[PDB]
From a paper:
The genomes of Bacteroidales contain genes encoding glycan-degrading apparatuses that typically co-localize in discrete clusters known as polysaccharide utilization loci (PULs). B. thetaiotaomicron contains almost 300 different GHs belonging to 60 different GH families, and secretes at least six mannosyl-glycoprotein endo-β-N-acetylglucosaminidases (ENGases, endoglycosidase hereafter) that hydrolyze the chitobiose core of asparagine-linked, or N-linked, glycans (EC 3.2.1.96). Here, we discover an ENGase from the GH18 family in B. thetaiotaomicron, BT1285, encoded in a distinct PUL with its own repertoire of proteins for catabolism of the same HM N-glycan substrate as that of BT3987. Altogether, our data suggest that human gut microbes employ evolutionary strategies to express distinct ENGases in order to optimally metabolize the same N-glycan substrate in the gastroinstestinal tract.
Numbering used by the authors:
A (entry chain A), B (entry chain B): 42 to 150, 163 to 507
The structure:
């Protein structure tokens, strides 16, 4: 009586994702009672167990026909111990392998059923055109990250025989361009660093493949500290910036623009004071020029007061497509009186439906025990206990970043909160980020999923 | 309106047999009306049609994952012609192909649905453990043939969705050993040529693999023209020959012996003359020694008279498991009076049930128009129109031999008569000899299925 168990996967029938490279796992035997005498059991492959697995679990899998290299298959179990040595399995990818899920059973002489997912050129097996239920907006810092990593990130939704895969993000924000004065000191202009220039300059390689995979790709525009910005433009300056943004979006085939309201370094006293009214007039002008292309707003603590009320009849929430904050790893509910976690009323935008507000914008930082309690607490209490279910439609991730030492814990969770609420809590569907675990996955701190190639 | 058809196969859905080697075929377009103008069409692969084929024909096929190399895919149809050029298709075997029957639809962009049977290491896909209805006995001339060709010959039984494969033979007779006088001329001794010595000396390679797939393997023992044989032995000579045969079967893991009563060159007038009583006495002693191992008898014109009668209370038909004749390509009915084909009364063995008698023994020789009419006539009239149904149990093929120029016609027929009667006539099941057609098949006169390797 024992259990052939996977060392690196809690699933009793682990599902490995094979994206044109080899995959591997170690398996071991776990006896119910300690071994009396030292015995050596051997693991072997028994592909004749496929049809029985299929009939029971409703699957239609085919035996994995590629080379499977089992090393240290002699499971030595020392006397007095309950868990044997670890055999190592490496599944070998070959281009002859068709894209599907395969089944390779392993027997001890219990049984562990390994399922291998051979990906197609663009997506894993069982990818569906069924769209994501919520809006997942992701940032990419073009200084450290390839925008095309979004086309390598998927959710594993459901359990067999109803397994489906979808892209983890629906909108991708590209960081960044900036607003600066021209050389003459009169007009604003958009400045592009070397990295954001290469991505835009080769959009058929970086932006257009994302769009073919169902992504809306926007350009984030921030401030460059010269005192000119979205909230203090005059009439002539505004027409310039609206024209340049309109041109930029059509020029490089972008789907919209993200207005990041920070790093403008506005002056506190003078004639060009930043106002919410100016911000409303500017976005209204931008909406007229770019039509149905997306406008999103990233509110910060440097944002102007008065967005809670109408400015000259304009409500910013009515003109923008989405809006979120820089209050990372915390759920911001501006519509909650006597909010136990904190008063988020400064983040109230007039005319903005709760469905257009990313209440949770997450970043890849390590969090304390109190920070983790506040995060999970503000998430569950506002969406489930307080009834603010309309705050589960937009989830924002400020920079999909490389997982390194220290941020491994937050790296596993800061992309799954959107699907956790919408799929696991609000429905029955289990969500899982793919390719996360395993060598070469996103959670491998010694690998890069989609690295920068310029 | 047109028909995409195969040149070498008249079936709409050709079933190609892939046994760890590549398989190929040519196709063409046949228009229902001549080409008004000169046009060129192109053929392609549409694995989406796999589903509708499955639903219509009740199959569970999966699209073929291997590489299909199509050449001349542009079909040139000159004006006034109804048939386009030929396109060549090669289906590539690879170790990454699991054993199954795969479907590969081919479209002109009518449809030709190709079915690929990727064999396992031992049998084609859809091989069944269901045993053969009749007993098919096959000889193998070890001087020209490898005994393991029997592990490559199958019957394709039925139609889809009720397709199955069985081995075409149940008993294999290995030619041959000889009985000669010892140096002093007082004892019989078994003699082995260089080829039959190698087969027995490496029975783990040649005999045992046949028995694993369910073959009963016997050794045929004839005469060497030295005047000593099964029918003139005394008491001391009989014990010696019985001992060495019992020893031979035990030594090489054989399942029985075939007593071929020919080429002994018995004396016409003298002291130790051949008699049917002597033969009955020797076989009775062989039955006691080898016990449940098989004794079979091949009667010839050189066989002794009186086998129709009980010799000293012994009936040879009671001690032998099977019996047949050397009267090739003609059904022999010794129990039928006023036989229109021929009086076969001299081939009658006392106490032999008809279910143990192989009335038809086939050999790979070309037949005249009259000889073929005698063959088909005697087979059909005796078993079906005269009601000798018990003569359909045992069928014999004397030397499964290489098909060459001149015997292509008899090559296709002389292995399927037993299945034609028992499966096609007496049941609804359709029989096909696999792997017969195609390059490398048994009917390819420029290839050897399982050749000699010694």
């Amino acid at each position: 009586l024992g259990v052939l168990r996977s060392a690196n996967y809690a699933e009793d029938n682990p599902l490995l994702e094979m994206d044109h490279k080899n995959v591997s796992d170690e398996c071991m035997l776990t006896l119910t009672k300690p071994a009396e005498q030292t015995i050596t059991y051997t693991v072997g492959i028994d592909k004749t167990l496929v049809g029985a697995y299929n009939g029971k679990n409703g699957t239609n899998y085919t035996p994995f026909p590629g080379d499977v290299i089992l090393t240290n298959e002699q499971l030595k179990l020392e006397k007095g111990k309950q868990e044997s040595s670890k055999a190592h399995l490496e599944f070998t990818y070959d281009k002859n392998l068709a894209s599907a899920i395969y089944l390779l059973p392993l027997i001890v002489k219990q049984t562990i059923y390994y399922r291998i997912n051979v990906w197609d050129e663009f997506a894993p097996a069982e990818y569906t055109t069924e769209p994501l239920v919520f809006t997942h907006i992701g940032y990419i810092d073009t200084e450290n990250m390839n925008p095309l990593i979004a086309n390598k990130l998927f959710y594993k939704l459901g359990r067999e025989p109803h397994l489906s895969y979808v892209h983890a993000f629906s909108v991708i924000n590209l960081l960044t361009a900036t607003v600066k004065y021209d050389q003459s000191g009169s007009m604003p202009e958009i400045s592009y660093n070397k990295d954001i220039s290469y991505v835009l300059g080769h959009a058929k390689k970086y932006i257009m493949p994302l769009q073919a995979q169902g992504h809306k790709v926007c350009l984030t525009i921030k401030g460059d500290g010269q005192g000119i910005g979205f909230s203090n433009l005059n009439a002539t300056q505004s027409q310039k910036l609206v024209y340049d943004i309109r041109k930029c979006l059509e020029i490089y085939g972008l789907d919209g623009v993200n207005l990041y309201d920070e790093d403008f370094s506005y002056k506190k006293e003078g004639d060009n004071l930043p106002s919410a009214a100016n911000l409303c007039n500017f976005v209204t002008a931008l909406r007229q020029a770019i039509d149905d292309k997306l406008i999103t707003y990233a509110m910060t603590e440097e944002s102007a007061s008065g967005l809670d009320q109408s400015q000259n009849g304009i409500e910013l929430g009515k003109i923008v497509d989405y809006a979120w904050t820089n209050q990372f790893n915390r759920l911001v509910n501006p519509w909650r009186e006597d909010n136990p976690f904190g008063d988020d009323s400064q983040w109230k935008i007039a005319g903005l439906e709760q469905t257009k507000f990313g209440a949770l914008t997450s970043t890849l930082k390590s969090l304390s025990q109190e920070e983790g309690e506040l995060m999970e607490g503000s998430i569950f209490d506002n969406i489930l206990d307080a009834g603010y279910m309309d705050l589960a439609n937009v989830f924002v991730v400020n920079s999909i970043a490389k997982v390194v030492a220290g941020v491994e814990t937050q790296g596993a969770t800061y992309l799954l909160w959107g699907a956790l609420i919408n799929y696991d809590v609000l429905q029955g569907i289990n969500p899982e980020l793919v390719p996360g675990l395993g060598k070469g996955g996103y959670l491998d701190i010694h690998s890069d999923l989609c690295p920068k190639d310029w």
